[PDB]
């Protein structure tokens, strides 16, 4: 279903001035979904994970690519923020909340949510700067995010409960930007 030729043209309609970047996203997007079509069934073992790392100046269209891609793509999309993220959830937020918002977009569809896309803005915010230290936005956030990005099942109460049960939604399948 994914097409790298057409997707580049589609992004051109909404984005201009970044031709090389469109080629990179089309390959990773196509490869990631192709992997899930036949999961770990090929002869090649230890297949490299397909992820995306957007790096560009201000006003370059980073937030724009996430919006245009969401409209064109059929799977649900989410737009989170790293500034709100905090470690051990004191008063700010928790990493697991990112999965809760994804289900709201997918209407509590685990089969449809695992094939979703994730985009985190202001990645530099979580940069570890602990020279003079506890730190709630530094190492703690990156450590929790790395655990999630590695691929692990996290408990998420579906609908919040009327039960004491949680669903083990996978994470290795979901993509991250």
Ligand X SMILES: Nc1ncnc2c1ncn2[C@@H]1O[C@H](COP(=O)(O)OP(=O)(O)OP(O)(O)=S)[C@@H](O)[C@H]1O
Q: Under the rule (CB under 6 A), what is the footprint of ligand X?
A: 15-17, 58-64, 121
User: Of 29 and 87, which CB lies nearer to other proteins in the complex structure?
Assistant: 87
- Contact yes or no for 51/173 (Cβ under 8 A): no
Cβ 52 to other proteins shortest distance, Å: 23
The partner in contact with residue 131, picked from ligand X, other proteins, none with C-beta cut-offs of 5 to 8 angstroms by kind, is other proteins
User: Of 60 and 86, which CB lies nearer to ligand X in the complex structure?
Assistant: 60
8-state DSSP, 5 = H
The partner in contact with residue 134, picked from ligand X, other proteins, none with C-beta cut-offs of 5 to 8 angstroms by kind, is other proteins
User: Of 7 and 87, which CB lies nearer to other proteins in the complex structure?
Assistant: 87
The partner in contact with residue 174, picked from ligand X, other proteins, none with C-beta cut-offs of 5 to 8 angstroms by kind, is none
The partner in contact with residue 87, picked from other proteins, ligand X, none with C-beta cut-offs of 5 to 8 angstroms by kind, is other proteins
Residue 173, class by beta-carbon neighbours within 10 Å (0-12 exposed, 13-18 middle, 19+ buried)?
middle
Breaks (C-N over 2.5 A) in the chain follow: 133, 162
- Contact yes or no for 66/119 (Cβ under 8 A): yes
Per CB under 8 A, 153 contacts other proteins:
no
Q: 3-state SS string over 14-41?
A: HCCCCHHHHHHHHHHHHHHHHHHHCCCC
Per CB under 8 A, 139 contacts other proteins:
yes
């Amino acid at each position: 279903l994914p097409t790298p030729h057409e997707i580049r043209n589609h992004l051109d309609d909404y984005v201009i001035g970044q031709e090389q970047a469109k080629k990179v996203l089309a390959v990773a997007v196509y490869n990631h979904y192709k992997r899930l079509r036949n999961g770990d069934t090929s002869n090649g073992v230890e297949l490299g994970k397909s992820n995306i790392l957007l790096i560009g100046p201000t006003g370059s269209g980073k937030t724009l690519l996430a919006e245009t891609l969401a409209r064109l793509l059929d799977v649900p999309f989410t737009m989170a923020d790293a500034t709100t993220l905090t470690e051990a959830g004191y008063v700010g937020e928790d990493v697991e909340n990112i999965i809760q918002k994804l289900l709201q977009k997918s209407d509590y569809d685990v089969q449809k949510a695992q094939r979703g896309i994730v985009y985190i803005d202001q990645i530099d915010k979580i940069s570890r700067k602990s020279d003079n230290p506890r730190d709630v936005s530094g190492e703690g956030v990156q450590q929790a995010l790395l655990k999630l990005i590695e691929g692990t099942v996290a408990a998420v109460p579906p609908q919040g409960g009327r039960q004491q049960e949680f669903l083990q939604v996978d994470t290795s399948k979901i993509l991250f930007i």
